[PDB]
């Protein structure tokens, strides 16, 4: 009877959408998947100006050097994020995520507001006119390209996180179907750099563009400095 | 309903790793390289050593559940690409061909015992649907009639299809219309309409050429141009001389390492002052030394019994009469027994032609005495003539045909122009000959003649000398005279079922110039219809004894009685012990 | 129609050779006498031949599969060496059927 | 002259002992008053039967 | 069961009710190569017949039921034969072989 | 699933057939002095009987694969042994089969 399609879109719904807090508060955030991700919900913390940081993976585990006031829980469709007693770094926007399928998906970002060693360096910012092409670089050091696949995600101003694609360790690329073959990723192993070329530009494609890399068998933990690409008429 | 997919697999190839991108078979500097599914891992590649090695990254190929189970023997799947892959491609919407090869990942049972945290497949199989078929084999035991793949249907046993040869006959027998009145040949003068060629059904042109060649020269020397490679049979197949097997000593198969079935031992060293003193040694020497106590492991096989059995079943047994056979179960068979399908699938038990049949005797099999033996796959001449055309069914050919008719062929022809016309047959059961004597029309053999060109070889005589010989050869006393080598009028009399006595009689006439009588017995089946032209009720395409001389029922005569007018005996005058009758054979003589 | 005897030897040369070797040409072709056809003689050693091979001119499905990936008898014999058995059982890919 | 070979009958090799590998059985004898009752037989017969 | 009629399936298939023939200890040992025993009946059997009180010859074949050591290790309620063997004296002889 | 190559045993067919030929047509016709009597099997008292001739045992190492290997040479013990008293004598074989089995 009831089977959920592997390798299909999973809508990650995060509630409350906004939240208000003061120091020492216990905070509770919830995430609901529309088709089951089993024990594989990952929780991220993102500052509005900086890249995503990994908190929780496999429904309850803390990533290396994440603080103790974080904890996760849940199974199947339902997962929970609990801040045992909130501190002043915790004012941020939090993201649900699952690596149970390709396309990989995130939520829309919830907003927590006040109650009133590896290096990946990307190419500099630019802008362009509709239908035009862009190529971004992502220089890597502190790993070699053949030992792990390298990801591309983007963040629009106002929106959530859009998984764009990936080039796996061996050179098998996989892209998001929303982009109708406009995404193309290449790499030079010897120069230790990954290239992301996007073609047929729209005004929708006005976003910050992120290089990322995952662990051994769990999510994204190493991020670039972001590349801003803008397109206006 | 809830039915579970069971796999029977084998992974011979050891790679470097197993990821979602497949098995890793190499490195492109920094980047790891994985197997191309279109043809790799490859069936023929596996371990290159004999001894036992643990393998933690292994791969091989497997057939899908949408692919009919066939026995491995005789299995063929045409290649789909130039990298030797077999698995089927599907033409997609965009117009490109796309691969159906799918990866199936597996782990060991102990590894599947855990919670998955450190789980990685130890094996990966590349599953594909290939267009399998069986060209040259059939099923000797079909266990079941149940639809789709199953373990009961894995029980299926194979047997190879019987050999069938088809060729042109010795000396192109019967291609030409000899001895039929309306289809009579023509040789005539251009200065006078009157045919030199007088032909009837009494005459037997083919046989006179056959017996004439025999009289002249050796027929065991095969010459291509005339297709003069004679039919024959192997004597040890016709006549079994059963001496028993040369199997006196035990013959053996052995392990890959010539040892096997090993046990673990830990070395010990003596204490030199004690009578039985001993100390363990686990220092420079292993505590787990493999040693096989006693002799190596072994298997036995009797070569000569298997070889003698295989010889007998292939060459004699499948050729036994139909009354000693049966029809295979869960496998269909043609209602018409002149098909190749019926000869090929009919089952004879090996116990009728096993080791001990006729043992210590030189004796042909009794069921085989009344079987024509020329009709057999070891007939060197038919095989030789089948190889003149080639290995293939489709053959563009060129052939050189002689005029075989006695009056014409020894003729020397002087100046003038002449009409020379002949007729040729196109019916496959006459112009072609098959090993089992199958009806070729129905079994779909066909011959289509392109062109024909009449060659003649001349002597370029000097003109004064040719004039002189012409003046002499044109005189009245010097006409040319010829005669047949057979020189006999040929007659066929019908014998009903089980009719033992065959009397015949000729009306009164003159008997000067009579040379004597000669006679045999033929079969109605094996004998074309005289002056038929074409006969759609002649269904046999083996050797033709009336034409090619392969008589074999001579043994079926008992005694002959010759009687002129009313009671005038021949030879008579008390010349033989039975004076009025020639007795050929007698059951247990005492006299 | 100038070839002879089911091969690519010509009628002219065949007559010429028969006339030189045994003097058969002018009075018709028949097998030579044994004492005259000996060890270094023509007919004694004369061997014509034919075989059929797959087409690539009107044969549309054609793929040229190399020796490097032929696997008729897979897992019963060494791989392109006289060595011991290598591989698994699987369907056979080569050659195409010239009969059937 | 490639005419193939006889292959009509399968050829087989067997253990030195004919039989090959075996397992150990105890005898049993039936209870005569029952349709399906059995009793071990350890009388004059071995408990290690091949 | 006739001794030449054996398994229909090649692969590893348990047999819940299995049956065969065996020689009784009153008959001596002989090798399988060279063994010949004439029929004691038209049914094909080699089993020796012993002459009964009322003069008729009668077969003395005896059934031997067996089950595995693991099944005879239990109490006896589930104890039932997986095998039934037909023990017989048969009239063996070796005529064209000798003992080497 | 089986991992690696298929299970197998190996046999060298021609050596066994040759070894059988060497023992059957030659070793069994050797001089009686090169033989021995079997241990624990009774034999005839008279050396001119089929029972004495059938049971004397000749070692196969006397006519093994390597002897004369690379030569055309008759066995030295057999140079003075009648070659027509033999079960390959097609003439004697034929004369017997004229009587039958």
Residue numbers in the entry:
A (entry chain F): 0 to 115, 131 to 247
B (entry chain A): 161 to 751
C (entry chain B): 752 to 851
D (entry chain B): 401 to 450
E (entry chain C): 201 to 300
F (entry chain C): 451 to 551
According to the publication:
In order to engineer a protecting function of a coat but without the liabilities of FX, we designed in this study a ‘stealth’ layer based on a hexon-binding humanized single-chain antibody variable fragment (scFv) derived from the murine monoclonal antibody (mAb) 9C1235. We therefore conclude that the trivalent scFv provides a high-affinity shield on the virion surface, most likely through avidity effects.
To evaluate the arrangement of the shield on the icosahedral capsid, the structure of the complex between HAdV5HVR7 and the trimeric scFv shield was determined by single-particle cryo-electron microscopy to a resolution of 7.4 Å. A three-dimensional (3D) reconstruction revealed additional density all around the capsid. In the naked capsid, the deep canyons between the inner capsid shell (red) and the trimeric hexons (yellow and green) are clearly visible by applying a color gradient indicating the distance to the center of the virion. In order to assess possible differences between the crystal and the in situ structure of the scFv–hexon complex, we performed molecular dynamics flexible fitting (MDFF) with the electron microscopy (EM) map of the shielded capsid. During a 1 ns MDFF run we observed only a very minor increase of the cross-correlation between map and structure from an initial value of 0.87 to a plateau value 0.90. This was mostly caused by a slight reorientation of the scFv on the hexon that did not affect epitope binding. This is further evidence for the validity of the structure of the complex and underlines the high stability of the trimeric shield and the hexon trimer. Especially around the threefold axes between hexons, the binding was sufficient for the flexibly linked SHP to be resolved in the EM structure.
